[PDB]
Ligand binder design. Structure first.
Ligand SMILES: O=C(O)CCC(=O)C(=O)O
Ligand SMILES: NCCC[C@H](N)C(=O)O
Ligand SMILES: [Cl-]
Ligand code: NI
Length: 253
């Protein structure tokens, strides 16, 4: 309670210091909207101490709740999901910093400032998820998100991109679960590829940016936290969660 109250104060001061440079914010909003992506590199998104607390929490959650999954997702053209993961109810049961950060007003206002929108909590069992890629073949195939505003926290990552785990993106698409047309979006757009290191945290426009994680080529450790927010002006009533159900499940396993 008191640690979280102090943490929110440190977050507000951190985000206010970034927002003070409006001319730089214009470029950040530009890049995020144009590319559907913006990376806060080298422990810059949060105060470094708080970020390292998140890294330790993710490691502890994997040590406690890790579940191996090797499935295909019919709503994303049957692309593969081969990973260890921890779902939202498991993170909600043992986590402390991650559930609090998801509800952080200063964090939501800062991301909303970049995105040009108001952030709100998404469907509960998708609010935060963890994935771990380790073995050759582990991947997070081509997909979209059901909700627009996703933050990916790089907990562990190989420094050599040849080992795998590269993120590739096609922005300004959208998700047709019955007719995804993934290859047509790839043919009609250039693909931008990104490599990430431990401490990176990147903002992703997940509902209109087709993306995937290049499969692992050699035994390594790639761990990410996914915090996902809806739009406060989302007027959708019939959002299906078939991808979350098959990869992470909705109950503590
Ligand atoms: O591992 C990444 O960098 C992205 C993972 C992802 O796309 C997701 O969690 O929805
Ligand atoms: N926030 C999690 C997004 C998962 C995505 N719909 C997928 O099929 O992997
Ligand atoms: Cl996504
Ligand atoms: Ni994704």
């Amino acid at each position: 309670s008191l640690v979280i109250e102090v943490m929110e104060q440190q977050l507000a001061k951190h985000f206010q210091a970034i927002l003070q440079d409006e001319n730089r914010m214009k470029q950040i909003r530009n890049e995020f909207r144009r590319d559907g992506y913006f990376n806060f590199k080298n422990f810059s998104f949060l105060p470094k101490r708080i970020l390292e607390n998140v890294h330790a929490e993710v490691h502890a959650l994997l040590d406690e709740y890790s579940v191996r999954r090797d499935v295909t997702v019919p709503s994303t053209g049957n692309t593969y999901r081969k990973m260890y993961n921890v779902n939202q109810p498991e993170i909600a049961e043992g986590g402390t910093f991650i559930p609090a950060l998801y509800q952080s007003e200063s964090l939501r206002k800062f991301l909303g400032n970049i995105a040009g929108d108001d952030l709100a909590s998404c469907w509960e069992q998708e609010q935060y998820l963890v994935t771990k890629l380790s073995h050759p073949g582990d991947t997070h195939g081509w997909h979209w998100g059901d909700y627009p505003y996703t933050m990916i926290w790089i907990i562990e990552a190989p420094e050599d991109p040849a080992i795998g785990g590269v993120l590739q993106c096609v922005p300004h698409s959208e998700w047709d679960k019955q007719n995804p047309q993934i290859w047509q979006y790839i043919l009609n757009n250039p693909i931008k590829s990104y490599h990430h290191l431990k401490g990176d945290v990147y903002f992703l426009k997940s509902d209109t940016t087709l993306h995937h994680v290049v499969p692992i080529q050699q035994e390594t450790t790639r761990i990410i936290l996914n915090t996902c927010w809806a739009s406060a002006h989302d007027r959708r009533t019939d959002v299906a969660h078939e991808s979350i159900e098959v990869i992470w499940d909705t109950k503590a396993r």
